[PDB]
Amino acid sequence: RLLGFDSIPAATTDTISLPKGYKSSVLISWGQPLHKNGPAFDPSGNGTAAAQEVQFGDNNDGMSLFEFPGEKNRALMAINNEYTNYRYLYPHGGMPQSAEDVRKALACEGVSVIEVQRKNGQWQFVQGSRYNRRIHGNSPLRISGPAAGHELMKTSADKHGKKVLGTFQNCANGKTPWGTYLTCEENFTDCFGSSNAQQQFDPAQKRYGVSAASREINWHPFDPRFDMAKNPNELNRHGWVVEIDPFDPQSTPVKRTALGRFKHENAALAETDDGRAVVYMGDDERGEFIYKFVSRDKINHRNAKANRDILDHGTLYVARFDAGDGNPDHPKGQGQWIELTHGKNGIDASSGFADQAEVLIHARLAASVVGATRMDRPEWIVVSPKDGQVYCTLTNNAKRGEDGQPVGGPNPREKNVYGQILRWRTDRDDHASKTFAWDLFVVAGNPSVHAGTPKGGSSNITPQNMFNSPDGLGFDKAGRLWILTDGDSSNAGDFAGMGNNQMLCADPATGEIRRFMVGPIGCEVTGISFSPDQKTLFVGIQHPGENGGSTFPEHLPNGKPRSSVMAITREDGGIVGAHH
Ligand code: VO4
Ligand SMILES: [Ca+2]
Ligand SMILES: [Ca+2]
Ligand SMILES: [Ca+2]
Ligand SMILES: [Cl-]
Ligand SMILES: [Cl-]
């Protein structure tokens, strides 16, 4: 079968726990200088913003690996850097106190492109490679697609609406079949505030969750780009899928507005039967939606550069899921893709949309007009390389059951603290289909605390493999589904026996799930990529010690913990997750 290791116990230690015959090594950590003679990481927090702009970013998250043509022992990795931990970033351990502190936080976020080389079966970071690069919160980027140059995308600093500074709050990823990387801007709204505490926000601004105080980010008092009283349109220039060419270190990344604006988690690539690109996308917020972009033109697989702007033309859709059959263990039903186009489905001037650019900039509002199904926090989406079935984590939803978020179909429990994994099979196995058959692949729960109730989870959950808040997902070439968690690590109450965050492996055809790895204290397990030969599984350990309980990975006395990308291998050199 696919699962070749024995399910490991849950753990609470400040280490990486793995099955018998597996080992882990740190590939790279937050603060690693990328270039030759680069500034060494300073554990005191006294490193400058300029140094952070040339060092591996903080809180590593989604990532992809790219092969080098003609060289099996080289590869590039594009790794997102989502946010930063103020307690560790600054020597003062608190909120930004200056323009330089804000620059230092912006420098932490974005993407880190690195070269990795294999020696004796072990992949290692190559400092000084010409491909090494930081794309950060103050990097010069381009805006393309239907919303580029729109009045809502113009600011005093960018009067033409096509040049944007930075990509930040970079959550998860996509890998295209034309050799490019997609990075997703998720909680971008958290970074904005206002010098006018009594600022009255419009319906689109309110729907995206912006506030005058910011969500404890507080950049706006030092950089007016984040001050909504002065640059309100800056909020519209973030929350997009950004395309990066990892093979060109001087290339300008492009915000692809055709894919819509929302709190993007990841971007799952697929292809229609007639050859067009498909990108499935989750909007991570309680009660938000699942989207699908289909390109206008066909993918040219043999001429990579002919697809340069394939993501600028196409159609954006949003999902509706029916009530299903009401099965308490394995609910299933039908769903559909509803087009988000001006002049269709009630999206027009009468519902507040003047043109298609506004539909994309305010995709959430357009999706509500068409009756999209409010979901339990869609996070990562993956497409099976064996049968094309699509998997989406619905991490949790403490507000499910409140007015406007009814219990039903793929969101079967009120006050959902555990989450579930939603699956859909596109009709006729054609990703161009506008309908699909959905089912809950797993309903997470705790059968040691809530046996025989909905909070006990589905029958493929046991006390031995139980987890909460599935977030990251990744398929390997063999078809194993890797599940990464970002849940409650209290190991108490509703989460008794679940321990620290972890990674599990599932057989999609049978529903069997086995616990594979447990991460250190205060982290979340996020980011997944495989070496081409599948003998190294790269996984991210994000924000170890977020509440001050970790020294991972260096374990120096009263040391500073650092987010890291880990390389997981078998002692016998075999394929990760396969039989021995
Ligand atoms: O950025 V997250 O929705 O995993 O917290
Ligand atoms: Ca996540
Ligand atoms: Ca999460
Ligand atoms: Ca998280
Ligand atoms: Cl439906
Ligand atoms: Cl902690």
Coordinates of C-alpha atoms and ligand atoms in Angstrom, one line a residue:
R1 CA 0.0 0.0 0.0
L2 CA 1.0 3.7 0.2
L3 CA 1.6 4.1 4.0
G4 CA 4.9 2.4 4.7
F5 CA 5.6 3.6 8.3
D6 CA 3.9 2.9 11.6
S7 CA 1.8 5.9 13.0
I8 CA 3.9 7.7 15.7
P9 CA 2.6 8.8 19.1
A10 CA 1.6 12.5 19.8
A11 CA 4.4 14.5 21.4
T12 CA 4.9 17.6 23.5
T13 CA 8.7 17.9 23.3
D14 CA 10.6 20.8 21.8
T15 CA 12.0 18.6 19.0
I16 CA 11.1 16.9 15.7
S17 CA 9.6 13.4 16.4
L18 CA 9.6 10.9 13.4
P19 CA 9.0 7.2 12.7
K20 CA 11.7 4.6 13.1
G21 CA 14.4 4.9 10.4
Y22 CA 13.7 8.6 9.7
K23 CA 16.0 11.6 10.4
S24 CA 15.7 15.4 10.2
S25 CA 18.2 18.2 9.5
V26 CA 17.8 22.0 9.4
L27 CA 18.1 23.2 5.7
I28 CA 17.8 26.9 6.6
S29 CA 16.6 29.1 9.4
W30 CA 15.2 32.7 9.7
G31 CA 18.1 35.2 9.6
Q32 CA 20.5 33.1 7.4
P33 CA 22.5 35.4 5.1
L34 CA 21.8 34.5 1.5
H35 CA 24.8 36.1 -0.2
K36 CA 28.6 35.8 0.0
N37 CA 30.0 37.8 2.9
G38 CA 26.4 38.4 4.0
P39 CA 25.6 39.6 7.6
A40 CA 25.5 36.8 10.1
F41 CA 22.3 36.2 12.1
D42 CA 22.3 38.2 15.3
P43 CA 20.5 36.4 18.2
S44 CA 20.4 39.7 20.2
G45 CA 17.8 41.2 17.8
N46 CA 20.3 44.1 16.9
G47 CA 20.4 43.0 13.2
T48 CA 19.4 45.9 10.9
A49 CA 16.5 46.1 8.5
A50 CA 19.1 46.2 5.6
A51 CA 20.6 43.0 6.9
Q52 CA 17.1 41.3 7.1
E53 CA 16.5 42.3 3.4
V54 CA 19.5 40.0 2.5
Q55 CA 18.7 37.2 5.0
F56 CA 16.2 34.3 4.9
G57 CA 12.9 35.8 6.0
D58 CA 10.9 35.0 9.1
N59 CA 8.0 32.5 9.7
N60 CA 8.7 30.3 6.6
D61 CA 5.4 29.0 5.1
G62 CA 4.4 27.7 1.6
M63 CA 7.2 26.6 -0.7
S64 CA 8.0 24.8 -3.9
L65 CA 11.1 23.1 -5.4
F66 CA 12.2 23.6 -9.0
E67 CA 14.5 21.3 -10.9
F68 CA 17.6 22.6 -12.7
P69 CA 17.7 21.4 -16.4
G70 CA 20.5 19.0 -17.0
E71 CA 21.6 18.7 -13.2
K72 CA 19.9 16.3 -10.8
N73 CA 22.1 17.4 -7.8
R74 CA 20.9 21.1 -8.0
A75 CA 17.5 22.7 -7.4
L76 CA 15.9 26.0 -6.5
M77 CA 13.4 26.5 -3.7
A78 CA 11.0 29.4 -3.4
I79 CA 9.9 29.8 0.2
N80 CA 7.3 32.2 1.6
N81 CA 7.9 34.3 4.7
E82 CA 4.5 35.1 6.1
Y83 CA 5.0 37.3 9.1
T84 CA 7.3 38.1 12.1
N85 CA 7.5 37.6 15.8
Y86 CA 8.1 41.0 17.4
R87 CA 9.2 39.3 20.7
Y88 CA 12.3 37.9 18.8
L89 CA 12.7 40.4 15.9
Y90 CA 13.6 43.5 17.9
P91 CA 15.9 43.8 20.9
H92 CA 13.0 45.6 22.7
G93 CA 10.7 42.6 22.0
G94 CA 7.7 44.9 21.3
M95 CA 5.8 46.9 18.7
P96 CA 7.8 48.8 16.0
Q97 CA 9.2 52.1 17.4
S98 CA 10.5 53.7 14.2
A99 CA 10.6 53.7 10.4
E100 CA 13.7 51.4 10.6
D101 CA 11.7 48.9 12.8
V102 CA 8.9 48.9 10.2
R103 CA 11.4 48.3 7.4
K104 CA 12.8 45.4 9.4
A105 CA 9.4 43.8 9.7
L106 CA 8.6 44.3 6.0
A107 CA 12.1 42.8 5.2
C108 CA 11.0 39.6 7.1
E109 CA 8.1 38.9 4.8
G110 CA 7.8 38.0 1.2
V111 CA 9.7 35.2 -0.5
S112 CA 13.2 33.7 -0.1
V113 CA 14.5 32.0 -3.3
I114 CA 17.4 29.7 -2.5
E115 CA 19.6 27.2 -4.3
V116 CA 20.0 23.8 -2.8
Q117 CA 22.7 21.2 -3.8
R118 CA 22.8 17.4 -3.1
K119 CA 26.0 15.8 -1.7
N120 CA 25.9 12.2 -0.5
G121 CA 22.1 12.0 -0.8
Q122 CA 21.7 15.1 1.5
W123 CA 20.4 18.5 0.2
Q124 CA 22.0 21.6 1.6
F125 CA 21.6 25.4 1.2
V126 CA 24.1 27.0 -1.2
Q127 CA 25.0 30.4 0.2
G128 CA 26.3 32.8 -2.4
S129 CA 24.4 31.3 -5.4
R130 CA 23.5 33.8 -8.1
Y131 CA 19.8 32.6 -7.8
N132 CA 19.5 33.4 -4.1
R133 CA 17.1 36.3 -3.6
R134 CA 14.8 38.1 -1.2
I135 CA 11.5 39.5 -2.4
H136 CA 10.2 41.5 0.6
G137 CA 7.5 44.0 1.7
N138 CA 9.4 46.9 0.1
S139 CA 10.5 45.2 -3.2
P140 CA 9.4 46.8 -6.5
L141 CA 6.7 44.6 -8.1
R142 CA 4.3 45.0 -11.1
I143 CA 0.5 44.7 -11.3
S144 CA -1.0 43.0 -14.3
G145 CA -4.4 41.6 -15.4
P146 CA -7.8 43.2 -15.6
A147 CA -7.4 45.4 -12.5
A148 CA -4.0 46.8 -13.5
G149 CA -4.1 50.6 -14.1
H150 CA -7.7 50.9 -12.6
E151 CA -8.6 54.1 -10.6
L152 CA -8.9 51.9 -7.4
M153 CA -5.3 50.7 -7.8
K154 CA -3.7 54.3 -8.1
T155 CA -2.0 56.0 -5.2
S156 CA -0.1 59.3 -4.8
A157 CA 3.2 57.3 -5.0
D158 CA 2.0 55.2 -8.0
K159 CA -0.3 57.4 -10.2
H160 CA -0.5 54.8 -13.0
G161 CA -1.7 51.8 -10.9
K162 CA 0.9 49.3 -12.3
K163 CA 3.8 49.5 -9.8
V164 CA 3.4 48.2 -6.3
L165 CA 5.9 48.0 -3.4
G166 CA 6.1 44.6 -1.9
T167 CA 4.4 41.3 -1.3
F168 CA 3.9 40.5 2.4
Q169 CA 1.8 38.2 4.6
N170 CA 2.9 35.5 2.1
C171 CA 1.0 32.4 3.2
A172 CA 1.1 29.4 0.8
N173 CA 2.0 28.6 -2.8
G174 CA 1.5 27.3 -6.3
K175 CA 3.9 25.8 -8.8
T176 CA 3.0 26.3 -12.5
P177 CA 3.8 24.0 -15.5
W178 CA 5.7 27.0 -17.1
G179 CA 8.5 27.1 -14.5
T180 CA 7.1 29.8 -12.2
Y181 CA 6.2 30.2 -8.5
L182 CA 2.9 31.5 -7.2
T183 CA 2.9 33.2 -3.7
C184 CA -0.3 34.1 -2.0
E185 CA -1.0 37.2 0.1
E186 CA -3.3 36.2 2.9
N187 CA -3.8 38.4 6.1
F188 CA -2.5 41.5 4.2
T189 CA -5.3 43.7 5.8
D190 CA -3.8 43.2 9.3
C191 CA -0.9 45.5 8.2
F192 CA -3.0 48.5 7.6
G193 CA -4.3 51.1 10.0
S194 CA -5.3 54.8 10.1
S195 CA -4.0 58.0 11.7
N196 CA -7.7 58.8 12.0
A197 CA -8.9 56.4 14.8
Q198 CA -12.5 57.4 13.8
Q199 CA -12.1 56.6 10.1
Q200 CA -15.3 55.4 8.6
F201 CA -14.6 52.4 6.3
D202 CA -16.8 51.6 3.2
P203 CA -18.6 48.3 2.6
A204 CA -15.6 46.7 0.7
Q205 CA -13.1 47.9 3.3
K206 CA -15.3 46.5 6.1
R207 CA -15.8 43.1 4.3
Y208 CA -12.0 42.7 4.0
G209 CA -11.7 43.3 7.8
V210 CA -9.5 46.4 7.9
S211 CA -9.4 48.5 11.2
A212 CA -7.8 51.8 12.2
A213 CA -5.6 50.2 14.9
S214 CA -4.3 47.4 12.6
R215 CA -4.2 43.8 13.9
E216 CA -1.3 44.5 16.3
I217 CA 1.1 45.2 13.3
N218 CA 1.4 49.0 13.8
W219 CA 3.4 50.0 10.7
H220 CA 1.2 52.9 9.8
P221 CA 2.5 55.4 12.5
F222 CA 6.0 55.2 10.8
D223 CA 5.3 54.4 7.1
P224 CA 2.2 56.3 5.7
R225 CA 1.9 53.7 2.9
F226 CA -0.1 51.6 5.5
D227 CA -2.1 54.6 6.7
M228 CA -5.7 54.4 5.2
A229 CA -6.4 58.1 6.0
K230 CA -3.6 59.0 3.4
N231 CA -3.3 56.0 1.0
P232 CA -6.7 54.1 1.1
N233 CA -6.1 52.6 -2.4
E234 CA -2.9 50.8 -1.1
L235 CA -5.3 48.3 0.5
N236 CA -6.4 47.3 -3.0
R237 CA -2.8 46.7 -4.2
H238 CA -2.4 43.7 -1.8
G239 CA -4.4 40.4 -1.4
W240 CA -3.4 39.0 -4.8
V241 CA -1.6 35.9 -6.2
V242 CA 1.9 37.0 -7.2
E243 CA 3.9 35.2 -9.9
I244 CA 7.7 34.8 -9.5
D245 CA 10.4 33.5 -11.9
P246 CA 12.9 31.7 -9.5
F247 CA 15.3 31.2 -12.5
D248 CA 15.7 35.0 -13.1
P249 CA 17.1 36.8 -10.0
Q250 CA 16.6 40.2 -11.7
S251 CA 12.9 39.5 -12.7
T252 CA 10.1 41.7 -11.5
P253 CA 7.3 39.7 -9.8
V254 CA 3.8 40.2 -11.1
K255 CA 0.5 40.5 -9.1
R256 CA -2.0 38.5 -11.2
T257 CA -5.3 40.4 -10.7
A258 CA -7.3 38.0 -12.9
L259 CA -7.2 35.5 -10.0
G260 CA -9.1 37.9 -7.7
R261 CA -8.4 39.8 -4.4
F262 CA -9.0 38.1 -1.1
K263 CA -7.0 36.4 1.8
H264 CA -5.4 33.8 -0.5
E265 CA -4.0 30.7 1.2
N266 CA -2.5 28.7 -1.7
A267 CA -3.0 28.2 -5.5
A268 CA -3.5 24.6 -6.7
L269 CA -2.7 24.0 -10.4
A270 CA -4.7 21.7 -12.7
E271 CA -5.5 21.6 -16.4
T272 CA -8.8 21.3 -18.3
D273 CA -9.4 18.6 -20.9
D274 CA -9.0 21.3 -23.6
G275 CA -5.6 22.3 -22.2
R276 CA -6.4 25.5 -20.2
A277 CA -4.8 26.3 -16.8
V278 CA -6.9 25.9 -13.7
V279 CA -6.1 27.4 -10.3
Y280 CA -8.1 26.4 -7.2
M281 CA -7.9 29.0 -4.4
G282 CA -9.1 29.2 -0.8
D283 CA -10.0 32.5 1.0
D284 CA -8.9 31.9 4.6
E285 CA -11.4 33.6 6.9
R286 CA -14.4 32.3 8.9
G287 CA -17.4 32.1 6.5
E288 CA -15.5 32.9 3.3
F289 CA -15.3 31.1 -0.1
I290 CA -13.4 28.7 -2.4
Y291 CA -12.5 30.0 -5.8
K292 CA -11.4 28.6 -9.2
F293 CA -9.6 30.5 -12.0
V294 CA -9.6 29.0 -15.6
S295 CA -7.3 30.6 -18.2
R296 CA -8.6 31.8 -21.5
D297 CA -5.6 30.3 -23.5
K298 CA -4.1 26.8 -23.6
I299 CA -0.9 25.9 -21.7
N300 CA 2.1 25.5 -24.1
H301 CA 4.0 22.9 -22.1
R302 CA 7.0 22.8 -24.4
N303 CA 7.5 26.6 -24.7
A304 CA 7.5 27.9 -21.1
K305 CA 7.9 31.6 -22.0
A306 CA 4.8 31.4 -24.4
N307 CA 2.7 31.2 -21.2
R308 CA 4.3 34.5 -19.7
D309 CA 0.9 36.2 -19.2
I310 CA -1.5 33.1 -19.3
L311 CA -2.8 34.2 -15.8
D312 CA -3.9 37.6 -17.1
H313 CA -6.8 36.3 -19.2
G314 CA -9.5 33.9 -18.0
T315 CA -12.6 33.4 -15.9
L316 CA -12.9 33.5 -12.0
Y317 CA -15.5 31.3 -10.4
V318 CA -16.7 30.7 -6.8
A319 CA -18.1 27.5 -5.2
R320 CA -21.5 26.7 -3.9
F321 CA -22.0 23.3 -2.1
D322 CA -25.4 21.7 -1.6
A323 CA -26.7 20.3 1.8
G324 CA -25.4 16.8 0.9
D325 CA -27.0 13.5 2.2
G326 CA -26.6 14.4 5.9
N327 CA -24.5 11.3 6.6
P328 CA -22.9 11.9 10.1
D329 CA -19.6 10.1 9.2
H330 CA -19.1 10.6 5.5
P331 CA -21.4 13.4 4.1
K332 CA -21.4 13.7 0.3
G333 CA -23.2 15.8 -2.2
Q334 CA -22.9 18.0 -5.3
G335 CA -21.6 21.5 -5.8
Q336 CA -21.0 24.0 -8.6
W337 CA -18.8 26.8 -9.9
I338 CA -20.5 30.2 -10.3
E339 CA -18.9 32.8 -12.6
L340 CA -17.7 36.1 -11.2
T341 CA -18.1 38.2 -14.3
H342 CA -19.6 41.7 -14.6
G343 CA -22.9 41.3 -16.5
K344 CA -23.6 37.8 -15.2
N345 CA -25.3 36.2 -12.2
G346 CA -26.6 39.6 -10.9
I347 CA -23.1 41.2 -10.8
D348 CA -23.6 44.7 -12.4
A349 CA -24.0 48.4 -11.5
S350 CA -27.3 47.5 -9.6
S351 CA -25.2 45.4 -7.1
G352 CA -22.3 48.0 -6.9
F353 CA -20.0 46.8 -9.7
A354 CA -19.1 49.3 -12.5
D355 CA -16.7 47.0 -14.3
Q356 CA -14.7 43.7 -14.1
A357 CA -11.7 45.3 -12.3
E358 CA -14.1 46.2 -9.4
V359 CA -15.5 42.6 -9.4
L360 CA -11.9 41.2 -9.0
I361 CA -10.7 43.9 -6.5
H362 CA -13.9 43.2 -4.4
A363 CA -14.2 39.4 -5.3
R364 CA -15.7 38.7 -1.8
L365 CA -18.6 41.0 -2.4
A366 CA -19.2 39.6 -5.9
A367 CA -19.1 36.1 -4.6
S368 CA -21.8 37.0 -2.0
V369 CA -24.0 38.4 -4.8
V370 CA -23.9 35.0 -6.6
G371 CA -24.7 33.0 -3.4
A372 CA -21.3 31.3 -2.8
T373 CA -21.4 28.9 0.2
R374 CA -19.7 30.4 3.3
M375 CA -17.0 27.9 4.4
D376 CA -15.1 26.9 7.6
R377 CA -11.8 28.7 6.8
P378 CA -10.5 27.2 3.5
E379 CA -6.8 26.8 3.7
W380 CA -4.6 24.7 1.3
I381 CA -6.0 23.0 -1.8
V382 CA -4.2 20.1 -3.6
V383 CA -5.0 18.2 -6.8
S384 CA -4.2 14.5 -6.8
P385 CA -1.5 13.7 -9.5
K386 CA -3.1 10.1 -9.8
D387 CA -6.8 10.8 -10.3
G388 CA -7.2 14.7 -10.3
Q389 CA -9.5 14.7 -7.2
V390 CA -9.2 18.0 -5.3
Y391 CA -8.7 18.3 -1.5
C392 CA -9.2 21.4 0.7
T393 CA -8.6 21.9 4.4
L394 CA -11.4 23.6 6.3
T395 CA -9.3 24.3 9.3
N396 CA -12.0 25.2 11.8
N397 CA -14.8 27.7 12.4
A398 CA -15.7 28.7 16.0
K399 CA -18.6 30.9 14.6
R400 CA -20.3 28.1 12.6
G401 CA -23.9 28.0 13.8
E402 CA -24.2 31.9 14.3
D403 CA -26.6 33.9 12.3
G404 CA -25.5 33.8 8.6
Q405 CA -23.3 30.7 9.0
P406 CA -25.8 27.8 9.2
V407 CA -24.7 24.2 9.9
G408 CA -24.9 21.9 6.8
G409 CA -23.2 20.1 3.9
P410 CA -19.4 20.4 4.1
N411 CA -19.6 22.5 7.4
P412 CA -21.5 19.9 9.5
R413 CA -20.8 21.2 13.1
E414 CA -21.5 24.3 15.1
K415 CA -18.6 25.9 17.0
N416 CA -16.1 23.9 14.9
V417 CA -12.8 23.7 16.8
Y418 CA -11.3 20.7 14.9
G419 CA -11.8 21.2 11.2
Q420 CA -12.3 18.8 8.3
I421 CA -10.8 18.0 4.8
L422 CA -13.2 18.6 1.9
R423 CA -12.8 16.7 -1.3
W424 CA -14.3 17.2 -4.7
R425 CA -14.3 15.2 -8.0
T426 CA -14.8 17.4 -11.0
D427 CA -17.6 16.0 -13.4
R428 CA -16.2 13.6 -16.1
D429 CA -12.7 14.2 -14.5
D430 CA -12.6 17.4 -16.6
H431 CA -11.4 20.5 -14.6
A432 CA -13.4 22.7 -17.0
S433 CA -16.7 21.2 -15.5
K434 CA -18.9 23.6 -13.7
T435 CA -20.2 20.9 -11.3
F436 CA -18.6 18.3 -9.0
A437 CA -19.3 15.6 -6.4
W438 CA -18.0 16.6 -2.9
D439 CA -17.4 14.6 0.2
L440 CA -15.7 15.1 3.6
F441 CA -12.5 13.0 3.3
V442 CA -12.1 13.4 7.1
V443 CA -13.8 15.2 9.9
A444 CA -11.2 15.9 12.6
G445 CA -12.2 15.3 16.2
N446 CA -11.2 13.8 19.6
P447 CA -12.6 10.3 20.1
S448 CA -10.9 10.1 23.6
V449 CA -12.9 13.1 24.9
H450 CA -16.1 13.1 22.7
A451 CA -16.6 9.4 21.6
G452 CA -19.9 8.7 19.8
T453 CA -20.6 12.5 19.1
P454 CA -19.8 14.8 16.2
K455 CA -16.9 16.2 18.2
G456 CA -15.4 12.6 18.1
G457 CA -14.7 13.1 14.3
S458 CA -15.2 10.7 11.4
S459 CA -14.5 6.9 11.7
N460 CA -11.0 7.3 10.0
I461 CA -10.0 9.3 13.2
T462 CA -8.9 7.3 16.2
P463 CA -7.2 8.2 19.5
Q464 CA -3.9 7.0 17.9
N465 CA -3.9 9.4 14.9
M466 CA -6.1 12.3 16.1
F467 CA -5.2 15.9 15.2
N468 CA -6.8 19.3 14.9
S469 CA -6.9 22.2 12.5
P470 CA -5.5 20.6 9.3
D471 CA -4.0 23.5 7.2
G472 CA -1.2 22.5 4.8
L473 CA -1.6 19.7 2.3
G474 CA 0.8 18.2 -0.2
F475 CA 0.7 15.2 -2.6
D476 CA 3.9 13.3 -3.5
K477 CA 4.4 11.5 -6.8
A478 CA 3.2 8.1 -5.4
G479 CA -0.2 9.7 -4.4
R480 CA 0.3 9.9 -0.6
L481 CA -1.6 12.9 0.9
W482 CA 0.5 14.7 3.5
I483 CA -1.6 16.7 6.0
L484 CA 0.1 19.5 8.1
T485 CA -1.6 21.0 11.2
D486 CA -1.8 24.5 12.6
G487 CA -4.1 23.9 15.6
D488 CA -4.4 24.2 19.3
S489 CA -1.3 22.7 20.9
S490 CA -2.5 22.8 24.6
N491 CA -2.8 18.9 24.6
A492 CA -5.7 19.5 27.0
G493 CA -9.5 19.8 27.1
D494 CA -10.8 19.3 23.5
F495 CA -7.2 18.7 22.3
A496 CA -6.2 16.1 25.0
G497 CA -3.8 13.6 23.4
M498 CA -3.1 15.6 20.3
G499 CA 0.1 17.2 21.5
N500 CA 2.1 19.6 19.4
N501 CA 1.4 20.4 15.7
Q502 CA 2.2 17.6 13.3
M503 CA 2.2 16.1 9.9
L504 CA 0.2 13.0 9.0
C505 CA 0.0 10.9 5.8
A506 CA -3.2 9.6 4.3
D507 CA -4.2 7.1 1.6
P508 CA -6.9 9.0 -0.4
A509 CA -8.5 5.9 -1.8
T510 CA -9.0 4.2 1.6
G511 CA -9.3 7.2 4.1
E512 CA -6.5 5.7 6.3
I513 CA -4.5 8.4 8.2
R514 CA -1.2 7.8 10.1
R515 CA 0.7 10.4 12.2
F516 CA 4.2 10.9 10.7
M517 CA 5.9 13.8 12.4
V518 CA 5.4 16.0 15.5
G519 CA 6.9 19.5 15.6
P520 CA 8.5 21.5 18.5
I521 CA 6.8 23.7 21.1
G522 CA 4.7 26.7 19.9
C523 CA 5.2 26.0 16.2
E524 CA 2.9 25.2 13.3
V525 CA 3.9 22.6 10.7
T526 CA 3.5 24.3 7.3
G527 CA 5.2 24.3 3.9
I528 CA 5.9 21.1 2.0
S529 CA 8.1 20.1 -1.0
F530 CA 9.8 17.0 -2.2
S531 CA 13.1 16.5 -3.9
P532 CA 12.5 15.2 -7.5
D533 CA 13.5 11.6 -6.4
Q534 CA 11.1 11.8 -3.4
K535 CA 13.9 10.8 -1.0
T536 CA 13.8 14.2 0.9
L537 CA 10.6 15.7 2.2
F538 CA 11.1 19.4 3.0
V539 CA 8.8 20.8 5.7
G540 CA 8.6 24.1 7.5
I541 CA 8.5 24.7 11.2
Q542 CA 7.0 28.1 11.6
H543 CA 7.1 30.4 14.7
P544 CA 8.6 27.9 17.1
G545 CA 8.1 29.3 20.6
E546 CA 5.4 31.8 19.6
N547 CA 4.5 32.0 23.4
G548 CA 8.1 31.8 24.7
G549 CA 8.4 28.0 25.2
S550 CA 11.0 27.0 22.6
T551 CA 14.7 27.2 21.8
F552 CA 14.3 25.2 18.5
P553 CA 16.5 24.4 16.5
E554 CA 19.8 25.5 18.1
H555 CA 18.7 24.8 21.7
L556 CA 21.2 27.2 23.2
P557 CA 20.6 28.0 26.9
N558 CA 17.7 30.5 27.1
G559 CA 18.2 30.8 23.3
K560 CA 16.1 32.3 20.6
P561 CA 14.0 29.9 18.5
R562 CA 14.0 30.3 14.7
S563 CA 11.6 29.3 12.1
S564 CA 13.3 26.7 9.9
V565 CA 12.9 24.5 6.8
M566 CA 13.7 20.9 7.7
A567 CA 14.9 18.1 5.4
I568 CA 13.3 14.8 6.3
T569 CA 15.0 11.6 5.0
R570 CA 15.2 7.9 5.5
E571 CA 18.4 6.4 7.1
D572 CA 18.3 3.7 4.3
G573 CA 18.0 6.4 1.5
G574 CA 14.5 5.2 0.3
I575 CA 11.4 7.2 -0.7
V576 CA 9.8 9.2 2.2
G577 CA 6.5 7.5 3.4
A578 CA 7.1 4.3 1.3
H579 CA 7.7 0.7 2.6
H580 CA 11.1 -0.4 3.9
Ligands
VO4_1 O1 -1.7 32.3 8.5 V1 -2.8 31.1 9.1 O2 -4.5 31.2 8.7 O3 -2.2 29.4 9.3 O4 -2.8 31.5 10.8
CA2 CA -1.9 28.3 6.9
CA3 CA -4.1 28.0 9.8
CA4 CA -1.0 29.9 11.4
CL5 CL -24.7 23.8 -5.2
CL6 CL 5.5 28.6 22.8

